[PDB]
Amino acid sequence: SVQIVYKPVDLSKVTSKCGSLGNIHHKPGGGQVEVKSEKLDFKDRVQSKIGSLDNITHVPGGGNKKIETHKLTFR
Amino acid sequence: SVQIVYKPVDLSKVTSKCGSLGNIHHKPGGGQVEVKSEKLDFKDRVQSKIGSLDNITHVPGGGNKKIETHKLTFR
Amino acid sequence: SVQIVYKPVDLSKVTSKCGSLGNIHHKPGGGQVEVKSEKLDFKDRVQSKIGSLDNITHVPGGGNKKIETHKLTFR
Amino acid sequence: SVQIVYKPVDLSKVTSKCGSLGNIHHKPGGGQVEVKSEKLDFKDRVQSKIGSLDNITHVPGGGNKKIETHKLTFR
Amino acid sequence: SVQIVYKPVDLSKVTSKCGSLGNIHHKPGGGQVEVKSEKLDFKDRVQSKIGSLDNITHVPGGGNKKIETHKLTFR
C-alpha cells in the first residue's frame, strides 16, 4: 500500500512600505538623429528603426512578486 | 491500494503601501529626426519605423503579482 | 508499505521599508547621432537600430520577490 | 532754477524653472497629547491652545518676489 | 542753477533652474506629550501652548527675491 500526504503550509508575507515615490524623469533621445543614405543595394529582408522607440518608464508602488509551484507526480 | 491527499494551505500575503506616487515625466524623442535617402534598391520585404514609437509609461499604484501553479499527475 | 508525509511549513517574511524614493533622472542619448552611408551592398538580411531605443527606468517601491518550488516525485 | 529728471529704467527679470515639484508630506502632531489639571487658580486672563494648531504647508510653483520702492522728496 | 539727472539702468537677472524638487517629509511632534499639573496659583496673565503648533513646510519652486530701493532727496 502507498500513502502520500501532501500538506505544505504557507503563512508567508512579501511586503513593502514607501513613504513617497516620485520625481522620476526619463528623457530618451533628446539629441539630433541624422541618417543620410546614398546608393544602397539590399537583396534580402530589411528591418529599420530610427528615432526613439520602446523606451519604458515603469514605476509600481509595490512591484512585489511571489511565484510558487507545487508538483506531485505519481508513477 | 493507493491513497493521495493533496492539501496545500496558503494564508500568504503580498502587500504594498505607498504614501504618494507621482511627478513622473517621460519625454522620449524630443530631438530632431532627419532621414534623407537617395538611390536605394530593395529586392525583398522592408519594415521601417521612424520617429517616436512604442514608448511606455506604466505607473501602477500596486503592481503586485502572485503566480501559483498546482499539478497532480497520476499514472 | 510506503508512507510519505510532506509537511513543509513556511512562516517567512520578505519586507522593505523606504522613507522616500525619488529624484531619479535617466537621460539616454542626449548627444547627436549622424549616420552617413554611401555605396553599400547587402546580400542577406539587415536589422538596423539608430537613435535611443529600449531604455528602461524601473522604480518599484517594493520590488521584493519570493520564488518557492515544491516537487514530490514518486516512482 | 532747479531741474530734476528722475528716469530709472528697469528691464530686470526674476525667474524660476522647476521640472517637477511634489511628494511633500507634513505630518504635525502624530503623537498623543494628555493634559491633566487639578486645583488651579487663575486671577487674570488665560489663553490656552492644545493639540495641532497653525501648521502650514506652503508649496508655490514660483514663489518669486520683487519689491521696488521709488521716492522723490523735494523740499 | 541745479541740474540733477537720475538715470539708474537695471538689466539684471535673478534666476533658478531645478530639474526636480520633492520627496520632502516634515514630521514634527511624533512623540507623546504629557502635562500633569496640581495646585498652581497664577496671579497674572497666562499664555499656554501644548502640542504641535506653528510648524511650517515651505517649498517654493523658485523662491527668488529682488529688493530695490531708489531715493532722491532734494533740500
Numbering used by the authors:
A (entry chain A), B (entry chain E), C (entry chain B), D (entry chain D), E (entry chain C): 305 to 379
Quote the original article:
We used cryo-EM to characterize filaments from the frontal cortex of three cases of Guam ALS/PDC and the spinal cord of cases 2 and 3. Tau filaments with the CTE fold were present in all cases. The frontal cortex from case 1 contained a mixture of Type I and Type II filaments, whereas that from cases 2 and 3 had only Type I filaments. The spinal cord from case 2 had only Type II filaments, whereas that from case 3 contained a mixture of Type I and Type II filaments. High-resolution structure determination confirmed that the tau filament structures from Guam ALS/PDC are identical to those from CTE. By cryo-EM, we have shown that tau filaments from AD and CTE each consist of two identical C-shaped protofilaments that comprise residues 306 to 378 (in the numbering of the 441 amino acid tau isoform). They differ by the presence of a hydrophobic cavity in the CTE fold, which encloses a nonproteinaceous density of unknown identity that may be involved in giving rise to this fold. The CTE tau fold differs from the Alzheimer fold by having a more open conformation of the β-helix region, which contains an internal density of unknown identity. Type I and/or Type II CTE filaments were present in brains and spinal cords.
pmcAmyotrophic lateral sclerosis/parkinsonism-dementia complex (ALS/PDC or lytico-bodig) is a fatal disease found in the Chamorro population of Guam (1–4), some families on the Kii peninsula of Japan, and the Auyu and Jakai people of New Guinea. Abundant filamentous amyloid inclusions that are made of all six brain tau isoforms are characteristic of ALS/PDC. We now show that tau filaments from Guam and Kii ALS/PDC adopt the CTE fold in brain and spinal cord. The greater heterogeneity of amyloid filaments, when compared to CTE and SSPE, probably reflects the fact that ALS/PDC is a multiple proteinopathy based on neuropathology, as suggested for cases from the Kii peninsula.
